[PDB]
């Protein structure tokens, strides 16, 4: 009695491999050139797999890097047909705006007049616009220049398209499969008892944020802490909570957009006279909901450390404006809010709305890429934004004297972490249809 | 029997099952196996998938399995690779654990299979010469 090897075809075998994921959408000008993606399947199949304990891990999958590269390529493809806003770097004679300006908003805006080219090359025109203090610098009635003048020039956002983050589904080609972890109490790294094979990712919102995750996916049943190494001080911390808190951001400045002919078919959209009252843009959050969310986060973080230690929340450490303040987009306008009012509480063992001021920056350089900036044109009317916070990015401070009084500060420079709280369930594997299981057959010999 | 609905096991649904249970879900996996930067990347991905399927089909074609999913071979199974009972390797082990168990001997098995099929074709040619 002996055995004989037999080769099998189409057997379920998985191998960790990296592939190129193609985008897909409902296919409903569009935003971020969504026509490049094939239409999605209206009936995505979900196959729950039993008796499987496949390993899952974050900070190593190529899906986050692929999404980052795809966002960069889509951004470049969207900004390529737009008009290059290169010749406005001139001597801008700026004065301060005192038209019913408040005490806090004083000095933020500057009325600048300059000579701009027109459709005819041999003629120029004296035009006036309004620029924020963050977009102009002084050169030694004064003269100012744009912040991106000594840096590489950049284009402007075309008003035909908007920055709406429509959901996108990342689907793998033939010969690859996508596995998701359906465990509600799924750890940051470890085996998942409930694995499900899915056609491709669910509606993923490509939101842009640097301090607080918003418009993302909510938790299953409770708060969860994710990190590649909890004991590592330099490693980022991603906290996700089930009940979202609503934030109401407003830009009460009723500015008027003005079109300036700067050449053949080139229109520069500048900020005209702001009619009505002027006030600083700001966001509001509920005090009770934020306190409850902070308490739940503290309770969930206390199990990772000792029950007798205390934890204090501090503001941003410093650096550039990209990471020291919460930067986001609403109605095409970029907001930079000072979140020092939220992380100003301590936690010891055992009419009601918080307001935080925000600044508007026109010369925006997203994706932390030196050069290749983007001029955000002004939006007519009062900008009203409503959002739900679905997570935060915390960072533990150094030192840690006697493992007590742990201070957490917001942060996060790279945008990959913004998607690490969304693509953590999903993973891609390569299927191997080859098997060599033996049996007692011999085959008809000739 | 006019309103009978037919449903089969899903794609990769027999991964956690036994060897014998997953042995009848090969056809579903076999049939489910198959602006310039986006087009070239998706085209390269599709071409790579087609080339991988072509390589697998050629690997089964050089052996005595030109088309059939289940096929035997006259070469025996040595106990150096895996010395396990047939009563428990087919009813108490999945394809993942079994593939990870002998993943170091796949190249040796493939090489012996190809040389055995080559000598089998030579023997068949010599037998037909009578």
């Amino acid at each position, epitope marked *: 009695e002996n055995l004989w090897v037999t080769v099998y075809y189409g057997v379920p075998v998985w191998k960790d491999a990296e592939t190129t994921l193609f985008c897909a959408s409902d296919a409903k000008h569009n935003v971020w050139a969504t026509h490049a993606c094939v239409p999605t399947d209206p*009936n995505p199949q979900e196959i729950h797999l039993e008796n499987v304990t496949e390993e899952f891990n974050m900070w190593k999958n190529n899906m986050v890097e692929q999404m980052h590269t795809d966002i960069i390529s889509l951004w470049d493809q969207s900004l390529k047909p737009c008009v290059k806003l290169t010749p406005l770097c001139v001597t801008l004679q700026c004065t301060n705006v005192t038209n019913n300006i408040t005490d806090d908003m004083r000095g933020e805006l500057k009325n600048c007049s300059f000579n701009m080219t027109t459709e005819l090359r041999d003629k120029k025109q004296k035009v006036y616009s309004l620029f924020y203090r963050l977009d102009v610098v002084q050169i030694n009635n004064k003269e100012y220049r744009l912040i991106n003048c000594n840096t590489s020039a950049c284009t402007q956002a075309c008003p035909k398209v908007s920055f709406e983050p429509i959901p996108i589904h990342y689907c793998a080609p033939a010969g690859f499969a996508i596995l998701k972890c359906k465990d509600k109490k799924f750890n940051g790294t470890g085996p998942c008892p409930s694995v499900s094979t899915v056609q491709c990712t669910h509606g993923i919102k490509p939101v842009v944020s640097t301090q607080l995750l918003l418009n993302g996916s909510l938790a299953e049943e409770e708060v969860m802490i994710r990190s590649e190494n909890i004991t590592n001080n330099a490693k980022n911390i991603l906290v996700q909570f089930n009940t979202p808190v609503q934030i109401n951001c407003t830009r009460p400045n009723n500015n008027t957009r003005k079109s300036i002919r700067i050449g053949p078919g080139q229109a520069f959209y500048a900020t005209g006279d702001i009619i009505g009252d002027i006030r600083q843009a700001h966001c509001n959050v509920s005090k009770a909901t934020w306190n409850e969310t902070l308490g739940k986060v503290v309770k969930q973080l206390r199990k990772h450390f000792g029950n007798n230690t205390i934890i204090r929340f501090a503001n941003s450490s410093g650096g550039d404006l990209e990471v020291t303040t919460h930067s986001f987009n609403c109605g095409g306008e970029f907001f930079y809010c000072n979140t020092s009012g939220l992380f100003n509480s301590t936690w010891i063992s055992n009419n009601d709305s918080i307001t935080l001021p925000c600044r508007i920056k026109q010369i925006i350089n997203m994706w932390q890429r030196i050069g290749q900036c983007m001029y955000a044109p002004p939006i007519q009317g009062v900008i009203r934004c409503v959002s739900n916070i679905t997570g935060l990015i915390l960072t533990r401070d150094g030192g840690s004297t006697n493992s007590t009084t742990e201070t957490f500060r917001p942060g996060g420079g790279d945008m990959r972490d913004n998607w690490r709280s969304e693509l953590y369930k999903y993973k891609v594997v390569k299927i191997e249809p080859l098997g060599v299981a033996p049996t007692r057959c011999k085959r008809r010999v000739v | 029997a006019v*309103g*009978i*609905g037919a*449903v089969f*096991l899903g794609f990769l649904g027999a991964a956690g099952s036994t060897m014998g249970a997953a042995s009848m879900t090969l056809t579903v996996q076999a049939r489910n196996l198959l602006l310039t930067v986006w087009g070239i990347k998706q085209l390269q991905a599709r071409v790579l998938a087609v080339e991988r399927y072509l390589r697998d089909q050629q690997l089964l074609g050089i052996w005595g399995c030109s088309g059939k999913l289940i096929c035997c071979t006259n070469v025996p199974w040595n106990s150096s690779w895996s010395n396990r009972n047939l009563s428990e390797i087919w009813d108490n082990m999945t394809w993942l654990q079994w593939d990870k168990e002998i993943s170091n001997y796949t190249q040796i098995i493939y090489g012996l299979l190809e040389e055995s099929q080559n000598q089998q074709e030579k023997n068949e040619q010599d037998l037909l010469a009578l």
Partner: antibody
Amino acid sequence: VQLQESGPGVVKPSETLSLTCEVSLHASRVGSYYWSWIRQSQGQRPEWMGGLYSDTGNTDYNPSLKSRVSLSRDMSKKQFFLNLRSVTATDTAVYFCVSRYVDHWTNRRFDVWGPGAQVTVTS
Amino acid sequence: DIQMTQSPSSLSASVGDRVTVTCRASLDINKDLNWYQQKPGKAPALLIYAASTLQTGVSSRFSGSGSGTQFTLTISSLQPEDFATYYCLQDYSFPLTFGGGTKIDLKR
């Protein structure tokens, strides 16, 4: 795998009656099901109105009520509707939504029947 | 259409009785018939499918026999929970029709 019916329990006469049945598909199963509607009056034998498939949608209606019955379905929200225009007093019965599908993996018929909803036609 | 015949309508039987229910068809059905049991306030449940195979989850006491236009349901040992209405449904071709019903109660 369970089925459930939903809709107005009490309806007025002469208008179109709409019923919705939610389906609980079997986990890790791909293929085609056969959804059908069967009503049963009080103290009377049940009556089958129509049926349809899940992948092709081939609707089969009873010749005695083909001019009023209408079966529709959608995979977007995974639901199937039943419409019966010009309801009469004889339409007062308990409606049931059934799903017939034979699982080739276990060789079982899986004849599941919903609890049914009582529909009364009166003014 | 197709008429479904079934006999009898109501009959008396005791616990552990050997009882059969007949069911006839207007045309040729061969073996595409199923037996259903319905209780007051409950949905019908499948008992015997294809006139010869026992459905999973059902007791082995129920049995079916017959072919063509004749069908018969047989009980080996009657039990008190079997007191319900029984129906015979054809599945050879459309439309789907049921029988007249058979109610079994305790004999006295």
